[PDB]
């Protein structure tokens, strides 16, 4: 239920700021910069799963 509470506002933010949505969407090969992007953004925001 808190995975809901987490992920739903994750989606809220990702929707309202489409600019970085684009950058974490670019299908370049090595995700590592993008996983760093999203975790650097919201690691201290959420639970691990």
């Amino acid at each position: 239920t808190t995975l809901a509470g987490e992920l739903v506002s994750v989606a809220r933010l990702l929707d309202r700021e489409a600019v970085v949505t684009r950058y974490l969407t670019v299908p370049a090969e090595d995700a590592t910069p993008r996983i760093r992007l999203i975790e650097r953004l919201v690691s201290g925001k959420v639970g691990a799963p």
Binding site: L13, Y23, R34, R40, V46
Partner: protein
């Protein structure tokens, strides 16, 4: 929860990212489009 609007930082070091084989996405009649290749 919500970030402190520091997304611009996240993106600017996402490109602080700074092995480069772009992939063809479209092709036809002597014109191609290539994805990737951030430093061309």
């Amino acid at each position: 929860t919500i970030p402190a609007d520091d997304i611009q930082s996240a993106i600017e070091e996402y490109v602080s990212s700074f092995e480069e084989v772009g992939t063809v996405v479209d092709a036809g009649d002597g014109i191609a489009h290539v994805e990737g290749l951030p430093s061309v």
